[PDB]
Nucleic acid binder design. Structure first.
Ligand SMILES: [Mg+2]
Ligand SMILES: [Mg+2]
Ligand SMILES: [Mg+2]
Ligand SMILES: [Mg+2]
Ligand SMILES: [Mg+2]
Ligand SMILES: [Mg+2]
Ligand SMILES: [Mg+2]
Ligand SMILES: [Mg+2]
Ligand SMILES: [Mg+2]
Ligand SMILES: [Mg+2]
Ligand SMILES: [Mg+2]
Ligand SMILES: [Mg+2]
Ligand SMILES: [Mg+2]
Ligand SMILES: [Mg+2]
Ligand SMILES: [Mg+2]
Ligand SMILES: [Mg+2]
Ligand SMILES: [Mg+2]
Ligand SMILES: [Mg+2]
Ligand SMILES: [Mg+2]
Ligand SMILES: [Mg+2]
Ligand SMILES: [Mg+2]
Ligand SMILES: [Mg+2]
Ligand SMILES: [Mg+2]
Ligand SMILES: [Mg+2]
Ligand SMILES: [Mg+2]
Ligand SMILES: [Mg+2]
Ligand SMILES: [Mg+2]
Ligand SMILES: [Mg+2]
Ligand SMILES: [Mg+2]
Ligand SMILES: [Mg+2]
Ligand SMILES: [Mg+2]
Ligand SMILES: [Mg+2]
Ligand SMILES: [Mg+2]
Ligand SMILES: [Mg+2]
Ligand SMILES: [Mg+2]
Ligand SMILES: [Mg+2]
Ligand SMILES: [Mg+2]
Ligand SMILES: [Mg+2]
Ligand SMILES: [Mg+2]
Ligand SMILES: [Mg+2]
Ligand SMILES: [Mg+2]
Ligand SMILES: [Mg+2]
Ligand SMILES: [Mg+2]
Ligand SMILES: [Mg+2]
Ligand SMILES: [Mg+2]
Ligand SMILES: [Mg+2]
Ligand SMILES: [Mg+2]
Ligand SMILES: [Mg+2]
Ligand SMILES: [Mg+2]
Lengths: 271, 46, 93
RNA sequence: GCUCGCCGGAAGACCAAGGGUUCCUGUCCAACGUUAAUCGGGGCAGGGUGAGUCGACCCCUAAGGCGAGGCCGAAAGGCGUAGUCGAUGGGAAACAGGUUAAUAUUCCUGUACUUGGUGUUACUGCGAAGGGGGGACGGAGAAGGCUAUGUUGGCCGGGCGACGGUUGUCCCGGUUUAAGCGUGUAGGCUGGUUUUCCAGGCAAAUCCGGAAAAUCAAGGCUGAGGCGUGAUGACGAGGCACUACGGUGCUGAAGCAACAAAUGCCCUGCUUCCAGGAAAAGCCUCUAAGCAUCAGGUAACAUCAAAUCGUACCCCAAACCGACACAGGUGGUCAGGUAGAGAAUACCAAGGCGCUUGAGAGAACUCGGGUGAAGGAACUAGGCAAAAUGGUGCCGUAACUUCGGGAGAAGGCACGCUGAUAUGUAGGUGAGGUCCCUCGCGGAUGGAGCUGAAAUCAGUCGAAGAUACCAGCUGGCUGCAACUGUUUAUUAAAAACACAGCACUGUGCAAACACGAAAGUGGACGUAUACGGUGUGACGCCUGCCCGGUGCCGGAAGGUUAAUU
RNA sequence: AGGACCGAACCGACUAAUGUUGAAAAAUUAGCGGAUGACUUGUGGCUGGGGGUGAAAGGCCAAUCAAACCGGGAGAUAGCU
């Protein structure tokens, strides 16, 4: 659950940990791992294209199945595991034919449970169906947007998508952001919310904790010189400007979405 | 006091060596300039 | 097999010094100057053919030349190769 | 040559980087050396670096580089696929002794090991650019078992002391031995074996994964150290003869035990935590095409091969980076004694040095120190500087508090040596003996010997017993910043920056955003519990009114309005 | 357990004195801060000049930085000395 640390040092006073007794303690499944080196925010030109990224603990990549297309073969959950690469927990499932895969662990899924994908699967958490067959009002996760492409929506811990209507070839979803969207009825969705809903309750407690996750310090613009940021300069603390990004674009309210290719699928903006 | 020149043969050769010069058009221009000038040693490689 | 004239060219001169004399009297080794590009096998064959003496092994080292001075012009002597070849304990050139 | 002093976790000894002959010998003293110089890292000549096992090279990959085609770009070029490079990482193998003026795991002596090619014999299903296993991996912590190593005893050799004593419970020295081979131990991990079946591993597979049944539950893997051998050897104090005074030839005693003990090894182990901890080959195994009593594979034996390059010397420095023989800088390894917690510190060992100008004198003044009557911050911008405090054990300790702290609060007492308790205790270690068994590096019992605190009581010396070196000044009130951190390399370390936390706002994924004429790339192999931007800055109580101005968001009736016509 | 505590190596650089044609173009001596971590360090790699990088001082980018260095336009221009 959520555990408060004892204030035995200044850096511990505010730490809140999220501890799961049911996660595996051993090493992960070796055949489903590969390296991923860190970028530091640098692109192939070598330049910082995203600031505030660097360092952190080494991690290995767990190949997760977002497609779930081993159709019609029941599988049993072996163990829940810790994944460095995401907020959610992953679950190691064993297929009846001897194949092992990692999937996003939904809420309430424990070891020994039975999951299955396909058009004929039952309505149970962890089961994957084309959204044609899922009743309206169901809450799914790991939702696809193009058939056969892989789930892309509602993948972070505690997130899910509401199926609010089906009309012909399209189903209407309600995303966590509050946006109503249309997707083709043949895209697949996994039933139930994704687990580890306490992830948002953690408190890092100290600066080093954020440095462990690869986050570097953020320098305020108003603390720079004019040559470095539109906010720089001043004798003392001076602002007298409309807030903007480091590149001069207004940054409190100005909308930046510009994609006409996709405006047809948006029913309502997140408001 | 730590001074600016910290010798390292590998880095010297990789940054200023003959083959690093021949890699780029500008490097060949450097070599052509130094041949025209008449330099006894074209590069650090020597 | 190594062709004849390569054998005739690999050997240059016998090395004369007191360490060489000590080696001759103690371990039946002869020390001699060889081509800068000769190999242990080629020295093997050439000493066995041009002195009619059989040998156990060959040890080689390359001597770096000395930087010297001749009226303030600097000049470097050339590197050469030295061979320690051990005769087979019964021949005594 | 004798004596004196200094370092000794270095100012000793190896190596990497870097340098390149500075290394050793002979000779010279013009210049160089902050002086002289017979000397030298100086001049001149000669000599010196020996590898199947060390390193490179080589096989394999990381970050990253280059990149056939390709995509993109006025040109130049940019990115990138297949590939190919790239160690700071993974991959076979050697030790001890001797020897030169200068090299040595390279030479010699002795004893080993590795890989590969051939040939013979015997038996055989061999085969990959493919499948599977393995290689293969974090931080912290704890303990047990060991060794390096040290001390003491025993043993051997020598000694009997310049001045009182010293045949003894006395003094000095030595008491060493490797890889390999055999043994498989302390200990760690793991149930094993045989059938049958199978939507999996791009095809196949007897291999891996999965399912069921039967049977036995002891098999397997890993593993320091010890012991035996290596070793009837080598080494060995010290003797005997030359000395050409450097040292050279012959001989060679003892060569045991107990205790203590690592930061090293078992240990890539075990326990635990979250921040969840490289890759690929070598290696093992499976088959595909294919071949088919050929080839190939396994085993034994014989034989051949293991090339090329580095190897001198300095290496916390007079040889590297600093213009200098420059109080500077420079990664790794080794790690003795006494006291001590200790790699601090003091004095020493091995070892290495006295820092390349001296000789006098004993003024002011400057620098670095010692002491000081009475007073004790009166000094001064300011207790700046100095003085002072300082250890271990035990007693005791306030406001306030986020209940952890504050706190080593403050303050106090004891502290040496000798004897006894106890001819050395509690404890630790542990031989002999005994008794067993599946017999062994075995189990139980026994306790010799060795080592050995702490305490109490009594005495005793001094002015002083934490005696030196070493080693907190303490308390009260208050501003600012919550805190650990970071910064103006070279006048500013702070109240500045960051920070966990908070809020606003953008972003529905071909995301926003950023680099880029573009292709692409980062964000992210992430998906709104996510990512970017902005402000504020732990925590507690909170965060009031104004939308007139300037922004931003929404609206789209009306007015005005571009190219166009 | 810990961006826990005391303290060497190690990394820094708060005070004072010396030095200031220095032993040294930033040090020495005595004290001082951190010392299991937002730590420190070796080796290699990447980012290039109106560009980089910056826990932000206009700091740093080879003793050079409110726009590096080298070469060129170039004998810039100079009502000024
Ligand atoms: Mg950011
Ligand atoms: Mg922030
Ligand atoms: Mg500022
Ligand atoms: Mg501006
Ligand atoms: Mg003001
Ligand atoms: Mg104002
Ligand atoms: Mg001393
Ligand atoms: Mg010379
Ligand atoms: Mg010399
Ligand atoms: Mg002189
Ligand atoms: Mg003279
Ligand atoms: Mg000389
Ligand atoms: Mg060689
Ligand atoms: Mg040999
Ligand atoms: Mg690559
Ligand atoms: Mg390329
Ligand atoms: Mg091309
Ligand atoms: Mg390669
Ligand atoms: Mg390497
Ligand atoms: Mg030597
Ligand atoms: Mg021992
Ligand atoms: Mg050497
Ligand atoms: Mg000197
Ligand atoms: Mg020096
Ligand atoms: Mg150092
Ligand atoms: Mg010391
Ligand atoms: Mg005086
Ligand atoms: Mg005094
Ligand atoms: Mg006085
Ligand atoms: Mg007095
Ligand atoms: Mg006063
Ligand atoms: Mg006054
Ligand atoms: Mg003071
Ligand atoms: Mg003092
Ligand atoms: Mg005030
Ligand atoms: Mg502060
Ligand atoms: Mg601080
Ligand atoms: Mg600093
Ligand atoms: Mg400064
Ligand atoms: Mg300062
Ligand atoms: Mg602020
Ligand atoms: Mg600390
Ligand atoms: Mg100091
Ligand atoms: Mg400390
Ligand atoms: Mg300023
Ligand atoms: Mg500079
Ligand atoms: Mg300019
Ligand atoms: Mg002009
Ligand atoms: Mg001019």
């Amino acid at each position: 659950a959520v555990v408060k640390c004892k204030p035995t040092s200044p850096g511990r006073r505010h730490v809140v940990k999220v501890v799961n007794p049911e996660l595996h303690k051993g090493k992960p499944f070796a055949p489903l791992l590969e390296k991923n080196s860190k970028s530091g925010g640098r692109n192939n030109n070598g330049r910082i294209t995203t600031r505030h990224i660097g360092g952190g603990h080494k991690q290995a990549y767990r190949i997760v199945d977002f497609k779930r297309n081993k159709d019609g073969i029941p599988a049993v959950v072996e163990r829940l595991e810790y994944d460095p690469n995401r907020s959610a927990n992953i679950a190691l499932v064993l297929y009846k034919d001897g194949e092992r895969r990692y999937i996003l662990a939904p809420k309430g899924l424990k070891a020994g449970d039975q999951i299955q994908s396909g058009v004929d699967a039952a309505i149970k958490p962890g089961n994957t169906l084309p959204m044609r067959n899922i009743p309206v009002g169901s809450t799914v996760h790991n939702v696809e947007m193009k058939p056969g492409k892989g789930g892309q929506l509602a993948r972070s811990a505690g997130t899910y998508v509401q199926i609010v209507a089906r009309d012909g070839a399209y189903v209407t979803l309600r995303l966590r952001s509050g946006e109503m969207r249309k997707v083709e009825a043949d895209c697949r969705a996994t039933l139930g919310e994704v687990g580890n809903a306490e992830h948002m309750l953690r408190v890092l407690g100290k600066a080093g904790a954020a440095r462990w996750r690869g986050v570097r310090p953020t320098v305020r613009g108003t603390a720079m010189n004019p040559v470095d940021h539109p906010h720089g300069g001043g004798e003392g603390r001076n602002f007298g400007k409309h807030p903007v990004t480091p590149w001069g674009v207004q940054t409190k309210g100005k909308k930046t979405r510009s994609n006409k290719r996709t405006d047809k699928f948006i029913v309502r903006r997140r408001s | 006091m730590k001074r600016t020149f910290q010798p390292s043969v590998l880095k010297r050769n990789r940054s200023h060596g003959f083959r690093a010069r021949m890699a780029t058009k500008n490097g060949r221009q450097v070599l052509a300039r130094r041949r025209a000038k008449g330099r006894a040693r074209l590069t650090v490689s020597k | 097999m190594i062709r004849e004239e390569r054998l005739l060219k690999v050997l240059r001169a016998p090395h004369v010094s007191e360490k060489a004399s000590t080696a001759m009297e103690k371990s039946n080794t002869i020390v001699l100057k060889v081509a800068k590009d000769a190999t242990k096998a080629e020295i093997k064959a050439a000493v066995q053919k041009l002195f009619e003496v059989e040998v156990e092994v060959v040890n080689t080292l390359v001597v770096k030349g000395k930087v010297k001075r001749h009226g303030q012009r600097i000049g470097r002597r050339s590197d050469w190769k030295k061979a320690y070849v051990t005769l087979k304990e019964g021949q005594n050139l």
